Amino acid sequence: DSLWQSEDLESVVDEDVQRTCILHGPVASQYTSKVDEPIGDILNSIHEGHIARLIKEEYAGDESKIPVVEYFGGKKPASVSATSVNIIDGNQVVYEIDSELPNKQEWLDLLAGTELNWLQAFISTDRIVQGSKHVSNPLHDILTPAKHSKVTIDKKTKKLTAFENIKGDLLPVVEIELVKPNTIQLSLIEHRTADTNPVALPFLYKYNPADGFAPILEIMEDRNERIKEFYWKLWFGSSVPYSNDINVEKAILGD
Amino acid sequence: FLDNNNDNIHSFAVKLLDDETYPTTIAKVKENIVKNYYKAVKSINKVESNLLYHCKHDAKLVAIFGGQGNTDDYFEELRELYTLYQGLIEDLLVSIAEKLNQLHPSFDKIYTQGLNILSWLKHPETTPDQDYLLSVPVSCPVICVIQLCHYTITCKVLGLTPGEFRNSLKWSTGHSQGLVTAVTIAASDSWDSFLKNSLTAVSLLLFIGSRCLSTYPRTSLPPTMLQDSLDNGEGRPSPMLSVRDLSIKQVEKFI
Amino acid sequence: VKANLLIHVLVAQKLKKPLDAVPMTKAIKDLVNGKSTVQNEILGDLGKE
Amino acid sequence: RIILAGTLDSNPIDDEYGFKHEIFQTSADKAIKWAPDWLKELRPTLVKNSEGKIYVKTKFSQLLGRAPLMVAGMTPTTVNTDIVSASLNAGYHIELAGGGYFSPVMMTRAIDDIVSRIKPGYGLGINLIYVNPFMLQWGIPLIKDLREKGYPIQSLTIGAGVPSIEVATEYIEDLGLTHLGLKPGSVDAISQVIAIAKAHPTFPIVLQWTGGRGGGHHSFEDFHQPIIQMYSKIRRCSNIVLVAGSGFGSDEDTYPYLSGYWSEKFNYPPMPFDGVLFGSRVMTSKESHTSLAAKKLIVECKGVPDQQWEQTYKKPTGGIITVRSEMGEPIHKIATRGVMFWKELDDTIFNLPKNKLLDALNKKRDHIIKKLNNDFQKPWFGKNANGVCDLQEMTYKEVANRLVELMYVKKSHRWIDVSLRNMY
Ligand SMILES: Cc1cc2nc3c(=O)[nH]c(=O)nc-3n(C[C@H](O)[C@H](O)[C@H](O)COP(=O)(O)O)c2cc1C
Fold first, then answer.
1. Distance CA A192, CA D98 (A)
2. Residue D188, by phi and psi: left (phi above 0), alpha (psi -120 to 50) or beta?
3. How far is the CA of D216 from the centre of ligand 1 (A)?
4. Which residues in chain A touch residue D61, judged by CB atoms under 8 angstroms apart?
5. Looking at the DSSP assignment, which residues form a beta bridge with residue D275?
6. Cβ distance B184 to B196 under 8 Å?
7. Gap from CA of A132 to ligand 1 centroid (Å)
8. Residue A90 CB partners (closer than 8 Å, separation 6+)
9. What dihedral do alpha carbons B127, B128, B133, B137 form, nearest 10°?
10. How far apart (Å, rounded) are the C-alpha atoms in residues D385 and D76?
11. Angle at CA D104, nearest 5°, toward D103 and D107?
12. How far apart are CA B195 and CA B189, in angstroms?
């Protein structure tokens, strides 16, 4: 156990460092010269040293020649021997599907598109931050391929709308679009109610371009009240307004 | 069997290995498929899909040429080539061996067992032991025959004149022995010019073959030495010794 | 279950050798042969067991 | 690309080189199986973010979403919930040192100090140590359900040993990590990581290569030579991210390691590294809990070039010697008086077998007691009437007052441990 004293030399015989063991490396010591510089400013000052060399060597001293992306991360560098012909980007798209073409994992790549944006992020991020969590992606299984389905992506990925066949008719069940700036609204539609009026479940996902490991963080504020107003329309109907001031102690009358 | 790759039986041969209906061996694939195709085929003078080098900035071909002593049993490569690709090279090596027999009696009394290669292929019982075959006046012409067949066949499987197959190559070189086949390769153009320069190659290495044995004749070795060399994990002693795993600066510290 | 029959059983499946191949006289260190992750895993399994 | 045009018996299982048919294929763009060029394919490039800040896009940076410069998880170093916190807030990756936590109640209390303080969306790793099978008895069942609770612990680096393949499957398949770090020390340890990546082809593996010139428990092999024999078949696994560490502290130092121009010292192709981890560089930082007089000592210790780190086994080289641990494997430490005294007992007493152990301690006794009191951090307990002594010649009151002297910090009014308070 001779080890913890390094950060607690005050509680040792006569606070003499010699009396103690400090684990350190022989070649690493010639770079450690100035004391109590912050742990950011150590790693920032040597990252920007690598940037300024790689600007000068490979980019001719120009910062504008550097490629620019919206977010950085998420797309796998591990390229297997796979057919890149079936990677399809489009402008104003419908994607009908039957039993064979395609399978699951490349269907998410068709709905991504080659250009980096919020929809490519939201279709293909492994994680959605739910108030400092990292839980699984909701679109990654609800957009699983199925028979007689089709999705609709129009005018440079600004709205994804997914269809599936019910009772012969074909109606929207999933809608993803941008709402008030830099926020995704996943509108998840339920059709079969008391008076066949479609009702949708409003989700709010915030998009963060600065973080690329988890670009889309779910707004957990006011989430339970959004989900309850949806079920209030289902179990009761739109004829009764949403009232959440139910006293718990009193008995609940029916009809 | 060959859909839109109708002149690609070489890759068709190795795709047959991958099946589980076929128990995998290469011996029943080389013959029974690739032997019998080139046995049955008419004129292969069909210049196939040569667009690989036509994008000149992106692909650069080099034919490279082995030397003396890459394997112990070297003549069985010419056995399997004559068994398989027989109609492709029969006009070639008959013209070779007729020149060798016109140059064979002038170096008698040092290799008495003949240099009749065409007898050694058509009649395997007429072949000497490999200790005569691995000797230098034998192996230096015949390795030049092996290298001039794999250039002949690659020109004839693709159906190319060697003067324009040489156009697909950027540069070429040879090792210890096969440098004469690299200068054969740039001098040959058509089918008539290639034979005239190949005969000057195989006749050349009959002089490199005979005079390097007539200058340094291998004498008998003490059986203490070679039995020690087999028991130490080394090879049977010969005038060239390969040292692996050591730098050039420290091997010359040992010599 | 006895200690002698316990350690042997767990070790037998770890070394993928016949139960007789592992003599209970010696130690795991000398039984493994030198592997840094071999001896560590062996003890780890028993440690949590 | 080598095309063996004489023989037709493709395919080799590793697909290093081609055979006869690859000359002949008449498909237009499907005929040409290219050779991997390491200088073009995995060179470090730059990229701007949408906010205009510039990153170095490597293969390690693309998986993490941040700069290719992580802080390696050390026992004593990575233990201050604060060094792992505000370096993640700088935007840099850190694995938490699992070795200084001893119960899953204490570590889950510690992880909650990070997650409450780092930005919503950042993640940390957990550096465990494979030669502590007690810590894997509670730490690995902790990571399985704590990730099922959904905490931001995103990776698990296993130091001091590469697991077997049936164990590393359970570390990948069940508990939901983003990527997994491995720290090989030998070529058989590197080729065991390649055995893991070919078992799980789509999951990232961060192969952390450290040489013997690092700090902490060392290694015998050289830094350059094992990967220079193995870089060819690491890169045939597209999931393995290769990270080099062990002695990196400046931008001019490790830029030849990212770019790959270091192997033209060795007459070899350029061999770029994906990422760079820091060990002993981060210890003198402001937000570490290394003592202030201990940080000044590291500053005073000038380093050693790479050409002469092998003489650390004999002499203080820049003030740092290796020394033998409890179970034999070496440990790089700074060369104070107590660590030089650690080596004096290693060459003389601790290498002896059991039959000469009790006799050597009897003849060396008052000399050992001399420098446990003077030089070493764990003193000799016996102290009667200001004279050093044996334990059985102390009264009970001066036994107890010596326990208050050696376990209670009177300047800060706290114990070293509660379990030492429960001893007194
Ligand atoms: C103070 C200190 C504590 C360390 N603790 C650990 C540990 O708990 N587990 C581990 O696998 N490596 C540990 N290391 C080794 C480093 O993670 C890394 O391999 C080495 O420091 C890199 O060498 P460098 O400091 O010269 O760059 C430690 C190194 C230092 C200097």
1. 52
2. alpha
3. 5
4. 72
5. D243
6. no
7. 29
8. A113, A153
9. -100
10. 36
11. 90
12. 10
Q: How far apart are CA D414 and CA D418, in angstroms?
A: 9
Given the residues B49, B176, B214, B238, select the one marked as catalytic. Answer: B176
Mutation choice for D interface testing from B3, B6, B14, B38 by most D CBs within 10 A: B14
Query: Could you say which of D11, D20, D32 has the minimum Cβ distance to residue B52?
Result: D32
Q: Is B176 assigned a catalytic role?
A: yes
Token look-up 């490569």 returns B77
Ligand 1, pocket-test mutation among D69, D77, D282, most atoms within 8 A of CB: D77
Does ligand 1 have an atom closer than 6 angstroms to the CB of D69? no
In DSSP notation, D37-94 reads -HHHHT--EEEE-TTS-EEEE-HHHHHHTS-SEEE---TTTTT-TTTTTTTTTTT--B
- Is the CB of residue D46 less than 8 Å away from at least one CB of chain A? yes
Measured CA to CA, the distance from residue B150 to residue B223 in angstroms comes to 39
**For the residues of D225-294, what is the DSSP string, one character each?**
HHHHTTHHHHTTSTTEEEEE-SS--SHHHHHHHHH-TTGGGTTS-----SEEEESTTGGGSTTS-S-HHH
Distances (CA, A) of B15 to B8, D19, D306: 11, 13, 51
Helices (H), A167-240: 223-235
Q: How far is CA A33 from CA D87, D245, D281, D285, D312, in A?
A: 20, 19, 10, 11, 21
Give yes or no for a contact between D183 and D205, defined as CB atoms under 8 angstroms apart.
no
Atom of ligand 1 nearest to the CA of D157: 11
Instruction: Take residue B65 and report the two structure tokens written for it.
Output: 């040429």
CA–CA min distance B78, chain D (Å): 10
| Option in D164, D185, D192 nearest C41 (CB) | D164
Sign of the C-alpha dihedral computed for residues D262, D268, D271 and D277 taken in this order: negative
Report resolution (Å) to 1 decimal: 2.8
Q: How far is the CA of D211 from the CAs of A51, D247, D332, in angstroms?
A: 26, 9, 12
Strands A216-218 and B61-65: unpaired
The answer to whether the beta carbons of residues D415 and D408 sit under 8 Å apart is yes
For residue B173 the two structure tokens come to 């070189």
> Which candidate from D154, D213, D297 shows the least CB-CB separation from A25?
D213
Give the strands of the sheet with D205-209, arranged side by side.
D69-71, D275-278, D240-244, D205-209, D179-182, D153-159, D124-129, D95-97
Residue D120 has which token pair? 């919503």
CA–CA–CA angle D252, D254, D260 (5° rounding): 115
Atom 3 (ligand 1) nearest CA: D74
The reply to whether CATH 3.30.1120.100 applies to domain A92-220 is yes
| Token pair belonging to D306 | 């790479």
With b for 16 or more beta-carbon neighbours within 10 A and e for fewer, the A167-186 pattern comes to eeeeebbbbbebeeeeebeb
A27 close to D (CB below 8 A): yes
- Judging by DSSP bridges, how do beta strands D240-244 and D205-209 pair with one another? parallel
Ligand 1 atom 6 nearest Cα = D74
Under 8 Å between Cβ of A209 and A71: yes
Rounded Cα distance, A62 and D58, in Å: 20
Whether residue D92 contacts residue D118, with contact meaning beta carbons closer than 8 Å, is answered with: no
- Three-state DSSP class for residue A119: helix
- Could you tell me the CA-to-CA distances from B164 to B168, B169, D4, D21 in Å, in that order? 7, 9, 21, 20
